[PDB]
Amino acid sequence: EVVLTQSPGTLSLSPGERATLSCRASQSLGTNYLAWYQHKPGQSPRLLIDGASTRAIGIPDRFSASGSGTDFTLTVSRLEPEDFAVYYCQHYGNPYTFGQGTKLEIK
Amino acid sequence: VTLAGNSSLCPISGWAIYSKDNGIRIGSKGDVFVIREPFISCSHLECRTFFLTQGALLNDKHSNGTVKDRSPYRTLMSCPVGEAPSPYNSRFESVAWSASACHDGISWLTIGISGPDNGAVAVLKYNGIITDTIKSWRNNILRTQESECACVNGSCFTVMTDGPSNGQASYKIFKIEKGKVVKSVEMNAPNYHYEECSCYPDAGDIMCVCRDNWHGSNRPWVSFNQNLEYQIGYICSGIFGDNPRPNDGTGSCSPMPSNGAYGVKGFSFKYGNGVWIGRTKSTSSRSGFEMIWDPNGWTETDSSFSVKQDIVEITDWSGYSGSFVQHPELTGLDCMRPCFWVELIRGRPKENTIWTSGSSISFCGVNSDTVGWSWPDGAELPFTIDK
Amino acid sequence: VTLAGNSSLCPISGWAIYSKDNGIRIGSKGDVFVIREPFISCSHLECRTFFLTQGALLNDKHSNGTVKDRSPYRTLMSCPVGEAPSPYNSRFESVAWSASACHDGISWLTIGISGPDNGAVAVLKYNGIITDTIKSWRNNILRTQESECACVNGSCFTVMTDGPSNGQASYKIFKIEKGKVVKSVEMNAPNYHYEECSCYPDAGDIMCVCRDNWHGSNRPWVSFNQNLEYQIGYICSGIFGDNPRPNDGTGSCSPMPSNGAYGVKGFSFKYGNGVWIGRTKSTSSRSGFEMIWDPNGWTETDSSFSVKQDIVEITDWSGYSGSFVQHPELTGLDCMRPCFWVELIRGRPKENTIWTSGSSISFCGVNSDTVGWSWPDGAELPFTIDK
Amino acid sequence: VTLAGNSSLCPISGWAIYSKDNGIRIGSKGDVFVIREPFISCSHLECRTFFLTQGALLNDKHSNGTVKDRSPYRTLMSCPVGEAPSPYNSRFESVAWSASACHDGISWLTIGISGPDNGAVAVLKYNGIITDTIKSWRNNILRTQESECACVNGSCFTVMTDGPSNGQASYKIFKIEKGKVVKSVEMNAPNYHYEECSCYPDAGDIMCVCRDNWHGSNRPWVSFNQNLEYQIGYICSGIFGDNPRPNDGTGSCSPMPSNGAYGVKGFSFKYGNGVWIGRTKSTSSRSGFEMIWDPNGWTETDSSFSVKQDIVEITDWSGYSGSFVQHPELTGLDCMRPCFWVELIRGRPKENTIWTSGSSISFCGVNSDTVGWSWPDGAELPFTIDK
Amino acid sequence: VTLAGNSSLCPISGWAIYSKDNGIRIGSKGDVFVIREPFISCSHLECRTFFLTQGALLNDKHSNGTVKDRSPYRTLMSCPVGEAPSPYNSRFESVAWSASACHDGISWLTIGISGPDNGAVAVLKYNGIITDTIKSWRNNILRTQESECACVNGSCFTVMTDGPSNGQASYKIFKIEKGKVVKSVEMNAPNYHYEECSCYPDAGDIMCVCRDNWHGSNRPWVSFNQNLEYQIGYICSGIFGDNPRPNDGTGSCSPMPSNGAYGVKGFSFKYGNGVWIGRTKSTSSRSGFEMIWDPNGWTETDSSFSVKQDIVEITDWSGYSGSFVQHPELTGLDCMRPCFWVELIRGRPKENTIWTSGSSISFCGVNSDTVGWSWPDGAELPFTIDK
Amino acid sequence: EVQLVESGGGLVQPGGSLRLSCAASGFSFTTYEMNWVRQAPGKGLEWVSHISSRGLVIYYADSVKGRFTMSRDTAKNSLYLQMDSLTVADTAVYYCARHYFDRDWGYSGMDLWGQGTTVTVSS
Amino acid sequence: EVQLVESGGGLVQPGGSLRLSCAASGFSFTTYEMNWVRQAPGKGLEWVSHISSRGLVIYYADSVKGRFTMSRDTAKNSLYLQMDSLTVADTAVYYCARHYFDRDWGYSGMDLWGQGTTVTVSS
Ligand SMILES: *[C@@H]1O[C@H](CO)[C@@H](O)[C@H](O)[C@H]1NC(C)=O
Ligand SMILES: *[C@@H]1O[C@H](CO)[C@@H](O)[C@H](O)[C@H]1NC(C)=O
Ligand SMILES: *[C@@H]1O[C@H](CO)[C@@H](O)[C@H](O)[C@H]1NC(C)=O
Ligand SMILES: *[C@@H]1O[C@H](CO)[C@@H](O)[C@H](O)[C@H]1NC(C)=O
Ligand SMILES: *[C@@H]1O[C@H](CO)[C@@H](O)[C@H](O)[C@H]1NC(C)=O
Ligand SMILES: *[C@@H]1O[C@H](CO)[C@@H](O)[C@H](O)[C@H]1NC(C)=O
Ligand SMILES: *[C@@H]1O[C@H](CO)[C@@H](O)[C@H](O)[C@H]1NC(C)=O
Ligand SMILES: *[C@@H]1O[C@H](CO)[C@@H](O)[C@H](O)[C@H]1NC(C)=O
Ligand SMILES: [Ca+2]
Ligand SMILES: [Ca+2]
Ligand SMILES: [Ca+2]
Ligand SMILES: [Ca+2]
Ligand SMILES: [Ca+2]
Ligand SMILES: [Ca+2]
User: Is D97 helix (H, G, I), strand (E, B) or coil?
Assistant: First the structure.
């Protein structure tokens, strides 16, 4: 089994600076199959990053992601009032797990 | 009269560029299909480019989400080589999301797979008339070469796969005469994986170099005669041809497990104990392309080669590649000429567009002087529809 | 090489997809006609798709209000099968708002009806040369098959209608040889209604399955020989083929009155006492399509069938359908191969657009394994011109 | 090989519509030429539409001010009949602002006039090869038929004009064999005016009905044999064919002066003493079109006819019209079939656009039943480029 | 049927316009290639226009910066003469940024140069099949005619250059038979410069008039027989043909150094001691075009000519020009007909656009009466993409 | 124009049974793989089960294995989930999600979701 | 472009006669069906008569049957209505309307109208 640990349990910032969220894999992942989801309360989750490096269709240029091996990073250069939600990292290769999430709220 | 196949591959030293369609550069303004998986197959009079359209034109709203391979709108068409695929100069061949096609010297044989994943059916057309069908025997995704099938002596041969894409599957060789499947055997290849084979005739036999998508970073091959009596193995050259692949080192004749559990369709030509390996320049992504000549790379596990020729640069996108031949009844020579094509994928997964498509370039092997350069796709992305 | 026609229909177990043009998906950006009522007719060398253009291109301001069937701008054209109808790859055939066409083995015969409602005239062209004309004999809307006519032995046969669309009309069978109408009889069919017949040859005779637009939710048929000596009736099968139709129950050999006073053009193939019924999946709207095999559905009224094959899903739009055959001089076989096409209407009367158009798919019957799927139109509406 | 030569015209009763291209309706979105002065000429295998492009596409900024007839950018092209003239389906013929073309049964003869007004030169091409040139002999605007020339027995005949457009000019008849002008005579026709003749063969002689642009509201004619031995006169029917013209009354066989000092290209067919007159419906503007049958209108000056057939409504624009024939080696019949075409001008001088163009319709005479209707242009103006 | 070419040039007095494509006027709205350096080569059945595309369409964002001559996206294509080059009517020939092509009476020979500047390789295709390659022998920019090569008796001859563009280079004559280079000699021409030769056959020998890009404002020529036994020199007329050039004065048979260190591709026809000189009207820029007939201009320095014919006016842009011939097996004559084409460059280096392109006009020499006019490009710049 | 609508959630006592139904529109199940994802109140998303486009159920979560049953009806385009022997830890909100297996590039990632249905257990 | 214009309206005494004329432009009567619709002051629209594109008069209203006569001239593109023995209940405003019979889908519905002419009866 492979557990994904998102280092910031909660993260508070102001509307307009860089936000870096991170996931650490317990075991290296030979599959490059790791995705990022944005979950706003009262709404269905939305796919932001697929393949750990590529924005989905319709996701703005504001988000970006990168990573290698066990380290994965999601960066928002300029936050917005609607950019505050819970962020999940998912490994959809074997074994199938989600991360625990991280909440972004206005400071 | 049908094509005999008794001739051996011609002696080569290098590859001279044959065609370039500039499909995506033209498709910015013109009405050009969103295609993928092109391949070139030659008759006894001409050579044509076969492609699998997405059912939509390029830079259009119906090209949104064309990264997907299986849809009821994909069709197999063909245009003359070196021309951009447009609805106004393309010939419709079959309805398919997986296909192959070849010419026996009399009429075109077209194989087109369509249908649900657990019930896909291959529809065999000969001269545009449906002649036979092959139904999936494992009720998994049935798939075929994506390149030309091989006729020797009026009989075209093809290889199909049905089963898991990350494990042991079922592999069949089909012998087709005038659209009828006259003979077929199921290969007994445990611990092997064959996908998207690129087959060529050589000395009256057929040679296929396929893609190992399960646990191999080198390429498997299968050779058989007209009785479908086959031999299996892997290319022992330490210059791995698959992608992703490890760095060059000591190679192996069994599958290479390291960094091997995916791949890309490729090819290779066997010259005695040597091999002409066509592979991407980067070991992690489909960028670049080169042709390697390992004089002992079919049976020796060294990592030392003799000649490189550059086709695209590590900075430019590449994609699938495959092999075709020009029969002596076309070229007029006394030997079968080896050629190959490369697909240059632009769009998603890697780029921030809504579509994915690919143009193509093709080279033919010559015994005279040649040069290595970079012939990239040249399209400037994103397009208008992405804004 | 005039067709022999003494051959009988081939034995079949299913239908394999033959073509798909993706006209409306391509026509979003490309220059593709606003067509409707396509049909496929095969010569002894090729098969062509005939369509009735509206005189305008798709996604253009002249496609405004193209729900109307009769205008002085409609023309009959033809393109090779499986290709989108565009002005750059289509051949002009006739000026018509109602048409049919077929090939006798030497030259194409084209029938095209145009003119006022009370004076429409059918212009018969043979090899592109006007040879004869037929004028309306009941000074009501004169109309013809909208599918291929049938030649047996060098003589093509067609059925035309003239009279009320909600009552008794006048029905004529025409025997045409090289563009001349050599013989015609007027059918004595009281309490019957025939519109938009789909005729095929079988064992030297002609068999037409038509649309009852007055009082029949099942389909009427007429069979005749080369002397125009005819028989009339209805398809007894309790599996009704018209649309709108009631739910399946006990059927009739005479008009079925319940929920029957409209229809859609369809077809059926007679195999002894059985029948292959092609019908939409929904009983109220033109959505879906399936092929039913009732082993005793030509004479028995049971409601019980043997095989279904799915063509389109009840959630996807469908439209007219018709039957064509591939003669043994084309396929090389010894039987007449039954095939069929379906029209997939997109646009008004049920979508919120300014235009209506239709693409097509076509299937051919085979004796090998086949699969049922859904091959829908796939167009994303509304277009730009609707905004 | 050679064509016609003894065949008189066919007995006829009406006209059945042959073709309709819908050029301007299609050209709103598609890439269609800005043409004018189309004409139809038939070979022994097909019929083609020849047109004079303005060098620009329709609904484009280069179509600004295309009301002008003489520019160095006009070219003569041809497309198959009934198809919209586009750069992707048209064949280039000659560089010309005045042209005519016809087929001798072996190869196409093309005449194209270009150059300055006082030095225009006609370039005669045969099978695409320049064979001869004719230079202006009065150093005024040299002009030719704008319709097909006539071959009888391998020799094509044409009529050219050079001189004032409001006074006495110079008229020449040319006999051309395989691109060489083998004989020519200059007509001695004082007080006559011939422009834009429409010539057809009849019983081994040639008959031309031309346009009187100086002082005549009826039409002049010239008939000659293969020796260029000619006769001249006017059509003495009281049903005037020119436009503008007075109201119908007592006609005459000498130039009709009243309201006659302009015109439009037209035609007429001589049947003994009768005549089939093709003329616009309005006497002041080019609106409408009808075919009149005056059983004694070639020699008697009455104003009473026998039959009218309506072609276009008086509320719809029309334009030039001309006559072509289908030789017995094309139709297979035993007599020469008379046909005609009409040009439907849309744009300036009468609509508030920047361009002028014209589509075409064409009819062929038959001995069976026919109907009169209106087949107008159908284009919705103004276009986008006019806004 | 191979062209024996024992024939001498036909007697002529002027030039009659043959074709005009209106590529840039049409390409404003239509999908027309960004081409440059067109040329016309005739087979024994037709004449085709060969052009070097930039890989992009006109009025598109990929036409940005198409002033550059060498890129991996340029390809050699061909369309029928007089038609605008579009992806929907063009035939792909080779991948090249420098090219030439000609027809031996059996199949087309195509030469296409591509690759890096210090390693460019010419790929020789015969009937679409790669037959031979020629590699750069000075590792400088290898370049060829940009016009048709010349076959006499089944052997096509071409001239290639490799070396400095402002100094002494290396000049080779190649004799090619069915795609194989059977013989080649390297010209010993010190203090000479040959670029972009325009060669024509005359009395069984080959005559090439080239461009001196180093120190000559007149044009050099080389004549050789089938043994590649050559003669070299310059044109001695005081009517200089290069551009830029000095004013007309006393000329020289050795390089004219004054104002001569650049040039433009041109041509000339030798008639005994006379010469037909085709040159631009302005001595400083590529504007205008005229044909000069100097009855003693091949051997005498005088600046006095006999006839001028105007092609384009000094206010309209012109560009490259070259010569082609129509063999007696095409025209049917007993002599070799001289023709020529002119390229009309629009866009940068002298207009404020992002692209450069060129349309073409072509003339053929006749012995009858002709006229001089101006047939300019006619395009209205800048386009939409420049805004 | 593609839609997935879950239904079936409600209040059920411990140890009971329930069955959800996700109706899909605009696409066919014979091409895309489907998933059941649950979010407990106060916890993150959890992957319950994953079924192929070939009809093979690839994945069950460890906690629910042996108790839940996932099935589908392709002729109806419906995805089902039978829960049996429900416990108090099964209180959550359930989503039916859709992703794709590409023959060349591989798996894709859950692209399309519904709002989901709440399943709660009391007493 | 397409236009319908009525004419002929006026003050007429009871028991008189009148005849309206609707001139149409941009389309031909040989393809579309035409209608006379009247609106009384204080009442809704009423369908007076309906004529085919074949020249057959399909419908008359019950009140006007036997008194009104509807005809057309296709060469002129004109639609006519002769009213005879007018009563006080015939005071209304009249429209000529146009609809279509599609060979496949059927009747269409009155798409194009004019402003109409007022017919009033006094004393
Ligand atoms: C692409 O698809 C998404 C829906 O999946 C849609 O939101 C977007 O509008 C589309 N974009 C284009 C360019 O059509
Ligand atoms: C090749 O084909 C011919 C004709 O079918 C046949 O006679 C011959 O045996 C074939 N060659 C082999 C080795 O099978
Ligand atoms: C369609 O035609 C109508 C007239 O019925 C016009 O009002 C409408 O604006 C036109 N629409 C378009 C999109 O061309
Ligand atoms: C069959 O064809 C020939 C030629 O058309 C004709 O003579 C004969 O009457 C036909 N036979 C039948 C069965 O009518
Ligand atoms: C037409 O040309 C005139 C100048 O002759 C120009 O002012 C006008 O803007 C042009 N119109 C268009 C649409 O180009
Ligand atoms: C008609 O053609 C023949 C050649 O076939 C030729 O000899 C003759 O001069 C021509 N003219 C006539 C009708 O005499
Ligand atoms: C043309 O190219 C330049 C870069 O050389 C770029 O800045 C500009 O945006 C391009 N312009 C157009 C119109 O594409
Ligand atoms: C012409 O070609 C022939 C071969 O066909 C060759 O032998 C001959 O030498 C060539 N011409 C001359 C006169 O050299
Ligand atoms: Ca691998
Ligand atoms: Ca080695
Ligand atoms: Ca019915
Ligand atoms: Ca009379
Ligand atoms: Ca110079
Ligand atoms: Ca001189």
Answer: coil
Q: Which two tokens stand for residue E115?
A: 């690759």
**What are the residues whose beta carbons fall under 8 Å from the beta carbon of B188, sequence distance 6 or more?**
none
| B chain contacts of residue A51, beta-carbon cutoff 8 Å | 349
Q: Please give the full DSSP string across E353-364, using - where no structure is assigned.
A: SS-EEEEEEEEE
CB B369 within 8 A of CB E133: yes
- Side-chain-side CA neighbours of B324 within 13 Å: the count stands at 30
- Nominal resolution in Å? 3.0
Give the span between the Cα atoms of B206 and B186, in whole angstroms: 16
Task: Give the position, in ligand 4's atom list, of the atom nearest the Cα of C2.
Answer: 5
Contact A57 B350 (CB under 8 A): no
Ligand 8 lined by E226 (C-beta under 6 Å): yes
Place of tokens 């069929």: C340
Lookup: tokens for C269: 């193939």
Find the residue in G nearest to D375 (Cα). G28
Q: CB neighbours of D305 closer than 8 A, spacing ≥ 6?
A: D239, D292, D293, D294, D295, D297
Residue G119 is encoded by which pair of tokens? Answer: 């017919």
Q: Are D256 and D266 in contact (CB under 8 A)?
A: no
Please state whether beta strands A19-25 and A4-6 pair in parallel, antiparallel, or not at all (unpaired): antiparallel
**Catalytic residue at E69?**
yes
Which residue lies with its CA nearest to atom 14 of ligand 7?
E61
CA F66 to chain C, closest CA, distance in angstroms equals: 33
E141, E122 Cβ separation under 8 angstroms: no
Q: Which of B59, B353, B90, B65 is nearest to C28 (CA)?
A: B59
Q: What are phi and psi of E375, to 5 degrees?
A: -115, 85
Give the number of C-alpha atoms closer than 13 A to the C-alpha of residue E40, restricted to the C-beta side.
30
Which atom of ligand 4 has the smallest separation from the CA of C155?
5
The residue behind tokens 């591509």 is E114
Helix (H, G, I), strand (E, B) or coil at B62: helix
Q: Kindly give the residue spans of alpha helices, DSSP state H, lying in chain D.
A: 23-26, 328-331
Q: Which of C46, C332, C373 faces B115 most closely, judged by CB atoms?
A: C373
Six token digits for residue D22 = 């819908």
Task: Give the CA angle between residues E174, E176, E182 to the nearest 5°.
Answer: 85
| Strand bridging mode A10-13 / A103-106 | parallel
User: What residues contact residue G43 under an 8 Å CB cut-off, 6+ apart?
Assistant: none
Contacts of G72 in chain C (CB under 8 A): none
Q: How far is F76 from chain C (nearest CA, A)?
A: 10
Active site residue D126: no
> Which residue lies with its CA nearest to atom 12 of ligand 6?
D153
How many whole angstroms separate alpha carbon B286 and alpha carbon B345? 9
For residues C78 and C67, is the Cβ–Cβ distance under 8 A? no
Phi, psi of C19 (to 5 degrees): -150, 165
